[PDB]
Structures are given as structure tokens and as C-alpha cells.
């Protein structure tokens, strides 16, 4: 008979941080506000009544309806701080709570350190279908950023929102198998400055420096400095592996490290082939070898 309870939600995001690349998770600290209208009630002085923390339980035990809202994409139970009910004499009920949770989402870091991510929060009632409880609207409020040069991530655009219905095949046990879902999304790009100057720039100077073997004049010098170069990429690959995030795929920097290996290895072959087939003519590939590297690099 009765229509669904309309619930208005507002989410305040204080901080998105603690990205875990391999687990595709991220930490979110904020507030959730949920408002709906109940049966009108008496309140002291006919002013809004406030119920905090453990006291909320006494009211639910006394018959107050407080539906449980679940973060669909939260990993484990969120860390809930203070929580509050505001009951108005006209029936309005406003639930407010601080939360800190780990959230999951499809995250592609293949373009690291130039990757873009969409941090999302998915809210959905745990027990009441959209014939008993639906989300009427969603408002999102984010942090006011001063200067983003110090921030790991650069936010782009306003937070997007969606209200949709989720239908579950396994709930055919008349027409109450659908649930209302809120979705928040924060678009952000990574701050690459650190990785350009401390990782991509030095690795460039090292790969480039390896090309100077073609300027040593004896064959025993070209091949032996090549091992010093090979050893420099190894030492550098380990410097990066100790800082850059762990991923199940290669990134731009990894392919550069790999290219450093291939360049040095190929050079070691050209140095020996040119020796046994003291041909210093092909040793004039000082310009041929670097160009061939860059040509292959585009592909």
C-alpha cells in the first residue's frame, strides 16, 4: 500500500588517500548524512531532538526505524566514529556519521606516472528494496584545495553522482528484487613531477650515457664499459623497484629500464661482431645506434 520511503543523502569527502595499487583500494575519510520523514512525534520543547552514539540503540529498541546503509564497495567494515540522529517533531529524521573505510574500484595504472583514476563510493540499503526505500537525491561536497603542487593527486572537475536501480536475479523469492544505489565518483590525475625528475630523467641520462661506448677506441674498452653500464641499469632498476608501486603489468618506467637492457645488450653484440667481421668503420654507429633506438622506441 504505502509508497517507498524517500531518503536524501549528502556525502562530505575529507580525504582520498592511501592508494594500494596492487589491491586496487583507496582510503576515504568523510561524513554521510541521510534524511527521511517518519511518523510525527513529540519532542521536548517541540525543538529537534539529538541522539548520539550508544543512545541511538535505545531508540531503535523502542521502535525507531533506522535502516542500515552499506557501502557496496567498502573492503571490510568501515571505521565509524561519532554518529547522530536528529528527530524533528514533524517526523523528519536525519542520520549523520563519520566514516573511514577502504574502498575498491577498477584502477588501471598502466600509464603510470601519467595515470588517471576514478575513485568511487557506492551506497545501497542492506535490506530494503526500492519498494520500501529509495534514494531521492545525492549531494557531494569535497575539500577546498589551496595549492596542488604538494598534493599527490590533482582533482579534475566536480564530483559526479548517479542514482540507479540494481536488480538481483537471486531474489525471486513478486517484484521486490530491486535496490536503489547511489554512486559518487572523484576524477583525479597523478602528480608526475616527482617521477619525471627523480626517475625518468636520470634513467634517460644513463641510457644515453651507455651510448658513449662507441667512442672508446679499443675493443677491450668498449665491451668492458658495457658491463659497467649494464651494472648501472641493474642498480637503477632496483632503485625504482624499491619506490615505484607494485603492479601486475609493466609501466612506462619499466619499459625504459627494459630498453636500457636491450640497448646495452645489442651494443655488446655490435662491438664483438664488428671486431671479428678490427672493423672501426661500423664503430662509426655513434649516430646509427641511438637513432635506431629512438626509432624502435616509438613502436
Amino acid at each position: 500500500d504505502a509508497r517507498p520511503v524517500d531518503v536524501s543523502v549528502s556525502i562530505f569527502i575529507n580525504k582520498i588517500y592511501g592508494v594500494n595499487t596492487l589491491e586496487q583500494t583507496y582510503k576515504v575519510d568523510g561524513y554521510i548524512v541521510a534524511q527521511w520523514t517518519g511518523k510525527p512525534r513529540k519532542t521536548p520543547g517541540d525543538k529537534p531532538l539529538i541522539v548520539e552514539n550508544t543512545q541511538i540503540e535505545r531508540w531503535i529498541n523502542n521502535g525507531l526505524w533506522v535502516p542500515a546503509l552499506e557501502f557496496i564497495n567498502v573492503v571490510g567494515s568501515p571505521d565509524t566514529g561519532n554518529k547522530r540522529l536528529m528527530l524533528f517533531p514533524d517526523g523528519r529524521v536525519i542520520y549523520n556519521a563519520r566514516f573511514l573505510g577502504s574502498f575498491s574500484n577498477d584502477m588501471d595504472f598502466r600509464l603510470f606516472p601519467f595515470d588517471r583514476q576514478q575513485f568511487v563510493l557506492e551506497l545501497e540499503p542492506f535490506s530494503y528494496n526500492n519498494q520500501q526505500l529509495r534514494f531521492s537525491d545525492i549531494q557531494v561536497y569535497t575539500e577546498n584545495i589551496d595549492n596542488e603542487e604538494i598534493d599527490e593527486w590533482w582533482i579534475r572537475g566536480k564530483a559526479s553522482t548517479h542514482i540507479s536501480d540494481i536488480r538481483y536475479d537471486h531474489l525471486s523469492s513478486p517484484n521486490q528484487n530491486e535496490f536503489s544505489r547511489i554512486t559518487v565518483r572523484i576524477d583525479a590525475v597523478r602528480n608526475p613531477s616527482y617521477y619525471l625528475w627523480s626517475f625518468i630523467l636520470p634513467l634517460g641520462l644513463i641510457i644515453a650515457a651507455s651510448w658513449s661506448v662507441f667512442w672508446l677506441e679499443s675493443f677491450s674498452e668498449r665491451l668492458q664499459t658495457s658491463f659497467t653500464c649494464m651494472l648501472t641499469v641493474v642498480a637503477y632498476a632496483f632503485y625504482t623497484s624499491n619506490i615505484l608501486p607494485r603492479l601486475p603489468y609493466t609501466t612506462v618506467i619499466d619499459q625504459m629500464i627494459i630498453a636500457g637492457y636491450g640497448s646495452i645488450f645489442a651494443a655488446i653484440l655490435l662491438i664483438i661482431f664488428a671486431h671479428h667481421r678490427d672493423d672501426l668503420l661500423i664503430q662509426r654507429s655513434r649516430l646509427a645506434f641511438p637513432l635506431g633506438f629512438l626509432a624502435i622506441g616509438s613502436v
Partner: nanobody
Amino acid sequence: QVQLQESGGGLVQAGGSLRLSCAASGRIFSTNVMGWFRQAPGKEREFVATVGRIGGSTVYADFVKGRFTLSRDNAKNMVYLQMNSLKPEDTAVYYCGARIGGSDRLAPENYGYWGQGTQVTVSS
């Protein structure tokens, strides 16, 4: 390289209103760093207002008491302070500052590129 210029100050009677403006120019990426201060003759420059950390919030000194309101126009790099119900105690020079860094937007020491200021005199 940032320059701040205030305006909107003048003479007013007790209970009157003023609307102060501050125009920012130079290497500034947002008006959130901007904050209003005031300094009276022989008094320490004290905080007045600045944006809050979370969207929709604003920080006000204890003596504001709902009388002042901070608004902004990011597109034009400007902030405004609407001052209502002025009292003689509000007489002072009102300075516009930009938040350099730190983590205390109420501390004048975390602000720079101060402007010349606009005089506010509440007569009574």
C-alpha cells in the same frame, strides 16, 4: 608573484553595512588561499574570515557573530566580505592576505602578499 588590492571601505554609522572587495593578480591558482584580516591602531592584526577546508564551510573569528559573510568569484579571482550590523569596535584597517602554506589558516603568519588595506570607520 601575487598582488592583492582591497576596496569597499569607508565611513559608516553604527549598525550600517559595508561590502569589501579584494582582487588577486599573479601566480594564484584559486581564491581559497585568500583570507581577511584587520588591524586597529595599537592592536595586533587579527584574523577575520577565510574559506573552510570542506566545501560549504567558512571560518569566522569569534567576534563576527554571524554579522559578516565571505563569498567569492573564482572566475575573476576575487573575494568579498559583506559586513552588516557594524559596531564602533569594528573600526580598523582590513587587510587581504593570501595563505602561503602552513596548516593554520587562522594564523596571520601563514599569510603573505598582504595588500595596502581599506579603512573601515564605524562612527559611534
